[PDB]
């Protein structure tokens, strides 16, 4: 698809058999998801931006399907207001910036 | 141009006669640059960040050339981790996401 920037680039994602809204974010190195329960072990991490930092849980090899495209990689889970799809998964699905 | 995302989409911008590096950030509503002097009036503005809002200076109708594309719009100046070009100016240069 081609996603416009007149609005936040929100798309539907699926993790497990859960569908969620997520932002396609070229400024994010990493993918950050709203608080949710994922199986398995993880690593503590702190991620930051304007304002400061929040604590997240790093899970590896997590499948997220983005508009029918299956991406697998590291996800961070924490108290974010928005599900953020970062470059680590945007590359896998063939996403580019064009102008 | 077509920009892939295996690295940060950092580009050269020209603002106030200065060359700077900035990040093309579809996850950002607004363009936010590190502390600099800009011509004309500014107004205090609070913008949302991690763990709360942050003060920035708002300058309107500022010329910015991003990769050779002209934009004229609002630039916020404040304590951002990196110079970010957000959707307010990404729409002006014709940017979309594609996969
Ligand atoms: C605004 C806000 C409120 C509360 C919580 C969150 C998560 C939040 O968003 C932060 C966020 O969206 N992140 C950062 C983030 C996401 C998830 C958890 C923590 C931080 C993604 C990066 C990339 N795309 C937009 C952001 C660009 N950043 C610059 C970047 C180099 C970090 S930045 O420092 O946040 C920023 C935001 C606004 C103005 C100026 C600068
Ligand atoms: Cl990854
Ligand atoms: Cl603007």
UniProtKB/Swiss-Prot annotation, chains A, B:
Span of domain Peptidase A2: 20-89
- What residues sit in the active site? 25
Disulfide linkage: none
Please give the residue ranges the record annotates as the region Dimerization of protease: 1-5, 49-55, 88-99
Give the top-rank taxon of the lineage listed in the UniProt record for this protein: Viruses
Describe, as the record does, how this protein assembles with itself and its partners: Homodimer, whose active site consists of two apposed aspartic acid residues.
Tell me the protein's name: Protease
Q: To which species is this protein native?
A: Human immunodeficiency virus type 1 group M subtype B (isolate BRU/LAI)
- State the covered range within the intact protein: 501 to 599 of 1447
